[PDB]
């Protein structure tokens, strides 16, 4: 009966990890940051509105220059916007219209998209002779593609619904490393600022910190009660925020190995679809299912503003690398640039 | 501004092409096909003629789009909102699988999936076209085996007409919103025709209900 012995050992071992977690909990984030002055009410005006999509918008990603952004929609079109003049630089027709993610290469010569076809496709924007054409179709996943992020011009990390992430090589199209350990579908991921680690949110209410090089999970985080819909890294790199389906946000710290503060209100019962941080990390913008975006004071866990300008569910969020704007997409086929 | 004015007319040339594709896509009928794997969905597809399977067929100058999600094997809730907006949902259930087990028999597995897909919060007004395939294999099996293995509360003769009508009644009983959506039930033979016609008739009623919504009558 080694199965029962192993199960008992895991429960005892998990108790030891839990015992060490509360031992280091000397204080709380709210208690420490109670003396700080609030950021005050924040009002963001719609500085721009981008039209041209004819279906629900599922994902967008800001360019590294903080001027271009790529938006993915379910009508089969990938559109690159000039966020300063609303100009459409490119319009990429996709083979499959069921796309749930889009990524922008840090160099800017590539974009990626994927979805229910279980294939991540890389498109060449440089196009030395002609227009934008596909470059590689990274097949090998078993479930739907839920997120994808570029590490460089030749490496991309993709998380799918088959409970396993992966690290690809664009030149050969082979899975360099496969990450396993999740018990549910992986719905999002966020690369570290130093591009050495990343965190993945799954449907089992757990976020796991991976290592790109070694390929083994380093830490696990619990505290959510429903599916984690979106994850994002703190700009420092020693924390991250998760958005689950129980209408709550949590800020986990990579060194304390435990949740620090929670961002919940009694008025909101709708789950969070997207989260993002400001340039300094003081503001935690979260997109909800109740047709508007919210701004949270990450250091005091107090509501500080509402970006109510959408007539449908907000499905994606983005903050420029410069930090001077916020673009929020939604299912009403509209993108809006705020402040 | 000389180069900027040329960049604006490029965006406008992109805009006019986006509308042209959107007009073409709006004139197409999108359907969703579901089943229990070996329920005859492949058999149904032939009559109307990894990842997602897309099928294209036309009938009476109407272009249909069929999507098969039988190879996903993932959490249905996380990607079911993508199909919210299809004209109709096609459900395939094999009547011959009332005694085969996957435990629990395969028929109750079909009923469990039908209960969730019909009562989904995203599908509250989409018509469901229910297909009961394998009627030839079901009519011979009832002679040698009863229906009591499937439904223990069954009380009737072991004849095709009575047994077939009882299974249809059990599947329609799972419809909780009896006043908002209509469930179309058809009995599909292994080698038969007019099944694409049954989809055309059911889809037309959806378009009429859609057209009246623009005019405000319905």
């Amino acid at each position, epitope marked *: 009966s080694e199965l029962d012995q192993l199960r008992q050992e895991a429960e005892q071992l998990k108790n030891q990890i839990r015992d060490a977690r509360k031992a280091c909990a000397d204080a709380t984030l709210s208690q420490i940051t109670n003396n700080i002055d609030p950021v005050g009410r924040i009002q963001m005006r719609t500085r721009r509105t981008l039209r041209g999509h004819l279906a629900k918008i599922y994902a967008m990603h800001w360019g590294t220059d903080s001027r271009l952004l790529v938006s993915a929609s379910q009508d089969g079109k990938l559109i690159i916007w*000039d966020s300063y003049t609303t100009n459409k630089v490119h319009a990429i027709p996709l083979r499959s219209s069921w796309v749930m993610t889009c990524a922008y290469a840090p160099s800017g010569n590539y974009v990626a998209c994927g979805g229910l076809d279980n294939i991540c496709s890389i498109y060449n924007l*440089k196009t030395r002779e002609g227009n934008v054409r596909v470059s590689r179709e990274l097949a090998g996943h078993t479930g739907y593609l839920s997120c994808c992020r570029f590490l460089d011009d030749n490496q991309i990390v993709t998380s799918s619904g088959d409970t396993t992430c992966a690290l690809w090589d664009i030149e050969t199209g082979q899975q360099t490393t496969t990450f396993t350990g999740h018990t549910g579908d992986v719905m999002s991921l966020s690369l570290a600022p130093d591009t050495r680690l990343f965190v993945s949110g799954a449907c089992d209410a757990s976020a796991k910190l991976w290592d790109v090089r070694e390929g083994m999970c380093r830490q696990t985080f619990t505290g959510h009660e429903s599916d984690i819909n979106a994850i994002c890294f703190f700009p420092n790199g020693n924390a991250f925020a998760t958005g689950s389906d129980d209408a709550t946000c949590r800020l986990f710290d990579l060194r304390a190995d435990q949740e620090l503060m929670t961002y919940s209100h009694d008025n909101i019962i709708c789950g969070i679809t997207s989260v993002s941080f400001s340039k300094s990390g003081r503001l935690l913008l979260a997109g909800y299912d109740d047709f508007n975006c919210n701004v949270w004071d990450a250091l005091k866990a107090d509501r500080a503003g509402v970006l109510a300008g959408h007539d449908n569910r907000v499905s994606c969020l983005g903050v420029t690398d410069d930090g001077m704007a916020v673009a929020t997409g939604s299912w009403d086929s509209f993108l809006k640039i705020w402040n | *501004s*000389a*180069e900027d*004015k040329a*960049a604006v007319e*490029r965006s406008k*040339m992109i805009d006019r092409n986006l509308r042209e594709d959107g007009e073409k896509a709006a004139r197409e009928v999108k359907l969703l096909l579901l089943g229990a794997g070996e329920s005859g969905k492949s058999t149904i597809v032939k009559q109307m003629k990894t990842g997602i399977v897309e099928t294209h067929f036309t009938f009476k100058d109407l272009h249909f789009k069929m999507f098969d999600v039988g190879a996903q094997r993932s959490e249905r809730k996380k990607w079911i909102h993508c199909f919210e907006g299809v004209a109709a949902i096609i459900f395939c259930v094999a009547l011959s699988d009332y005694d085969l087990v996957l435990e629990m028999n395969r028929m109750h597995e079909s009923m469990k999936l039908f209960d969730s897909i019909c009562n989904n919060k995203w599908f509250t007004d989409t018509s469901i076209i229910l297909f009961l395939n394998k009627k030839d294999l079901f009519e011979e099996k009832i002679k040698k085996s009863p229906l009591t293995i499937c439904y223990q509360e069954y009380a009737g003769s072991n004849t095709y007409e009575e047994a077939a009508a009882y299974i249809q009644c059990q599947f329609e009983d799972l419809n909780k919103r009896k006043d908002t959506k209509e469930i179309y039930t058809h009995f599909t033979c292994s080698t038969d025709t007019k099944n694409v016609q049954f989809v055309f008739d059911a889809v037309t009623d959806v378009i009429i209900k859609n057209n009246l919504k623009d005019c405000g009558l319905f």
Partner: single-chain antibody
Amino acid sequence: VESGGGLVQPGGSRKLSCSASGFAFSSFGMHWVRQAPEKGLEWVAYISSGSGTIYYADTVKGRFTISRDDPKNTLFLQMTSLRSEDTAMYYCVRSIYYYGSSPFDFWGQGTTLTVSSDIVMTQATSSVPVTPGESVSISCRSSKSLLHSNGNTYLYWFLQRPGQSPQLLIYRMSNLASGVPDRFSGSGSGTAFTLTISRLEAEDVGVYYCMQHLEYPLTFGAGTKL
């Protein structure tokens, strides 16, 4: 690649044709820059993508006409009244305009034919010592400042190797064209612009032209032969 053109006629008419090949001709705006036997380049006409806005040089406004045929990927130029002032080699230049594009990137082979206000770019320098291995700077000047309110100075640097078509080195103030070695550099102040070359190779000889793109009646700088 692209090629095609007309031949010699006495004081009559001729139709110039270009044959685009494998670069998605339907989404490129095309020019018809021409160069006389011994002078610098001179812009002639332009037709945008989708046959929209069309511009003509002041000297060929009434006599010339430019049109494109997107199927079969062919560009046309029809000249009705032809004088002795317009004997030249007619080049075909492609150019696409979006946020980060590089116009005038590829120049056609060009064909010759014999018949038997605006912005002025000076480029006062006309001859430079040709010794290898030196760091040479080529200067330019403009009548009015090219620094648009957008923040980018529209100035393009072209190199014409002896016997071949012009090739784009620098587009706008400092951006380096694709395939150009990083030795070339470009800096300007809105009115005075310089092109810097670190180490001259045996293939760096030729005539260097500067072109503005602020107002569409655009002019070149007559070149500075090395």
